[PDB]
From Swiss-Prot, chains A, B, C, D:
Known tissue expression: Synthesized in hen oviduct and concentrated in egg white (where it represents 0.05% of the total protein).
UniProt name for this protein: Avidin
Known outcome of mutating residue 33 to T: In about 50% of the molecules
Binding site for biotin: 32
Segment of the intact protein contained: 26 to 149 of 152
Function: The biological function of avidin is not known. Forms a strong non-covalent specific complex with biotin (one molecule of biotin per subunit of avidin).
Localization annotation: Secreted
Disulfide bonds: 3-82
């Protein structure tokens, strides 16, 4: 009971993220510090904005967030669920869609990549 | 001339959405309206928060947004690009991931559905 | 009643495909003539191999097929259903995954694109 | 030395598969075995047909295959790449789409689930 979103997280590929307080409407903003950037870069930070679903006030709520990349013209969306694992650790399981910017509508069909990411807490 | 997100749109599925005004930051708010399991209790509306990529102030920007469902524990993410010419008409080309809430971590693998939607200006 | 796979089909982007006879096990092979090839080419043909699901002998059966590209190192998989539309026309609704070849396992996360395709019959 | 498809594998989900021998053409056959809704009636097995891309006889080829379910009307497609070093161990990195059968064309949009699976050599 209590899979909270707020905090610092790290994922399976080296990226880090920090999520602030979740308001009443279930809204939150935060930051994303990436690793893999289809040309990995030093340490570039971008903002994120999402919501957590509050229907039935579930302890392992679903969520979604958009990453507004600051060193590229692409956009990434992440969706998933905040779980309490068998060992009592908080875990974010996610899938994501990476939209690349094309010039012509005739190339739209190849602008979308898909994948997953797993996050666990940092704070230490 | 540019492809603006602000406004009223409808999709190939007959769903409609409204998008507020886009802040300097690329941030926006709106509403998503669908025929919640059509019939039973007609149509419902759920908020939606997202961003538009503004790097290099492109004319046909990429964006993404999260729809926080008001009648289910689910969450949906959309990402795509705002296009022009094909007549001179604005087109929203998107893909989404719909995440269902699951009770146990072992059921995670079957919680994500994926698809597309094309949005056009509301005949008005 | 009778959404059959055998034949010549064309899709929403200009690609063509011909599917041969479906055997007992539900197996079939055929050919794929593409249009968009992340660098569109004249007229390059590649073979395909898939199966149709025969459980309950459904009239609008699900299916899957793999395209073994002959001018590239990638692979594409297609899945969907063979429908009888309101107007009595046969229609294939599909989603597909395009795997690109990477050199290092550290780039695996970006090797997968997703999309859709709609096919209808040719034969005229 | 190369990454061979032929053999016995198991996945992160505890499912197992066998793959026959790969013909000149890149064609292969096998079997997929899972715990069909574990308990009720333990494990079941379903055939599987696919191909391996052989352009430029790469050491870590891409491939795809269709699993024709024997206890449901569903169809599943997998696509990925066969990798090496990480110790000297072969890894199958894949993504799939699972298509459910729907009764009416208007329900098509919710028929496709997407995910990943990592396969490793069967401890034997």
């Amino acid at each position: 009971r209590e899979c909270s979103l707020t905090g610092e997280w790290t994922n399976d590929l080296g990226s880090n993220m920090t999520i602030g307080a979740v308001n009443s409407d279930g809204e939150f903003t935060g930051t994303y510090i990436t690793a893999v950037t289809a040309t990995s870069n030093e340490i570039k930070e971008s903002p994120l904005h999402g919501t957590e679903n509050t229907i039935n006030k579930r302890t392992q709520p679903t969520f979604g967030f958009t990453v507004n990349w600051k060193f590229s013209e692409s956009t990434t969306v992440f969706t998933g669920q905040c779980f309490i694992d068998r060992n009592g650790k908080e875990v974010l399981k996610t899938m994501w869609l990476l939209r690349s910017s094309v010039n012509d509508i005739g190339d739209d069909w190849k602008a979308t990549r898909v994948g997953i990411n797993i996050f666990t807490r940092l704070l230490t």
